[PDB]
Structure formats: structure tokens, C-alpha cells
């Protein structure tokens, strides 16, 4: 198949549709720090806040 | 799907997972799904002429 | 045949389709996307009216 | 990123070669064998001078 025939032409896509997805979930959850978690973006969570 | 990672600019490169994809494969069965019946020419010209 | 044809002689070709249908998704991306300012600095400076 | 390609969906092409090398050399038949003789009759007769 045409994925297989080129195996880093669907990594890039994997990887970088999965981009966008990690991308996409941090900037809600994301504390600012920068480590593996919250990628060091701030995101709203850590931009707005948690909690009243 | 390759789950993504996270570095420092200044930090590892740290190579990461990637994806599965894997061949799916069905196989149109060696098995028919069938109906037989044997009918005589007897029957088939006498039910002709002599159908209600 | 019966016994000559053996399955690794067979290419079995696939069909030119692969199945990845994951999340993708990225509304909160979707928005505010098309606007992502790509700036030469590192730093983001703006002033805010506080009191 | 040997995982994006799985054993199954490689098709490995083939040598369009067969080692069909068996014993085909047949040179009884060989000799006397472009004169067969294709009869339409069962029965081949013929006379021998016994003495």
C-alpha cells in the first residue's frame, strides 16, 4: 500500500497529525512549566486559572 | 500512532515511538453460500403445459 | 494448483488503503490558527491597563 | 520506524525464476520419436520371415 511505500512520508503525517493533537490538548492543559507534560506552553489553564 | 515527545531547543534528541501499522487481511472464503435442486425434464414441460 | 500455487508464491496485492482515522481534531487549534504570528523573538511583550 | 512496515503489507517481488531443473533428458524416446507413427488403426501387422 501506499503507506508502506513510503514509510517516512506517513511518519511525517503521523507525526505531525499528532502534532497538531498534542498541540491542540496542551493548549488547554498546560501549567507553563516546561517539561514533558506541559510542553511549556501555559495554554488557558495556566493562563486563566483552575479554580474560582 | 508515534506518540510525541519533548526537548529543551538546547536538549536531547531522545527518540521516541512510533506508530503501528499493521496488514489487515480478509479472504473471500473458499466457501459458497448455495442452492441446488435438481429438476427433470419431465417435470419442467409437464408443470409448463399442465400449471394451474 | 492444489499444490502449485503456494501461498509464498502468491502476492496477495492489497488495496491502496491505509486506515489511520485518529483524533485529529484541533478546534481549539482550528481556532486562532490561521493567525499564529511567527515572531523573530523569543519574548511576547504587551502592555495591560490594570487599574 | 521498523513498526510502519509490517512484515505482512511487504510484497516481496519475485526472481521470475522456477527451479523446474528436473530429469527431462529422454533420448530412448528420443531416438524414435520424430518417427512415431500416428495410426488410425489399433493393430500394427506385419510379416516376419521366422525361417
Redesign the interface.
Known amino acids: ?3 508502506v511505500r513510503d514509510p517516512v512520508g ?1 511518519a511525517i503525517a ?1 507525526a505531525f ?2 502534532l ?2 498534542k ?2 490538548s496542551v ?2 492543559t498546560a501549567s507553563g512549566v516546561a517539561d514533558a507534560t506541559n510542553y511549556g506552553i501555559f495554554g488557558l489553564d495556566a493562563a486563566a486559572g483552575t479554580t474560582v | ?1 508515534g506518540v510525541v515527545g519533548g526537548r529543551t531547543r538546547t536538549g536531547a534528541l531522545a527518540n521516541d515511538t512510533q ?1 503501528t ?1 499493521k ?3 480478509l479472504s473471500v472464503p473458499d466457501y459458497y453460500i448455495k442452492h441446488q435442486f435438481d429438476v427433470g425434464k419431465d417435470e419442467i414441460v409437464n408443470s409448463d403445459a399442465t400449471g394451474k | 494448483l492444489t499444490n502449485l500455487t503456494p501461498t509464498e ?1 502468491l ?10 482515522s ?8 482550528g481556532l486562532l490558527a490561521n493567525r499564529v504570528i511567527n515572531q523573530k523573538q523569543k519574548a511576547i511583550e504587551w502592555g495591560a491597563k490594570v487599574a
Open positions: 500500500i501506499s503507506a506517513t503521523d497529525d499528532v497538531s493533537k498541540i491542540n493548549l488547554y | 500512532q506508530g501499522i496488514g489487515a487481511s | 508464491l502476492a496477495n496485492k492489497a488495496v491502496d488503503y491505509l486506515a489511520n485518529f483524533l485529529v481534531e484541533t478546534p481549539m487549534l
